[PDB]
Amino acid sequence: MGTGKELVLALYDYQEKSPREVTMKKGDILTLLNSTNKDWWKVEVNDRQGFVPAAYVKKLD
Numbered sequence: 001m002g003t004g005k006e007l008v009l010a011l012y013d014y015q016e017k018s019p020r021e022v023t024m025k026k027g028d029i030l031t032l033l034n035s036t037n038k039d040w041w042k043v044e045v046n047d048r049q050g051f052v053p054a055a056y057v058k059k060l061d
Contacts, residue, residue, distance in 0.1 A: 006032045008043060008057040022050030030057060 010028040031044035
């Protein structure tokens with residue numbers, strides 16, 4: 001991004017189910033931190049960070 005990492009769009013609401021996940025609401029614009037895993041991407045949701053299912057977000061690119 002002009003300054004940083006790529007953004008992704010939340011496609012669905014998702015509630016964190018373990019300590020390493022994070023919650024997102026449908027339509028949130030998240031910062032993508034790590035997409036090395038094909039199943040779980042690490043994102044920044046506002047001011048919180050964690051993994052969400054990769055299928056639930058869409059790269060803005």
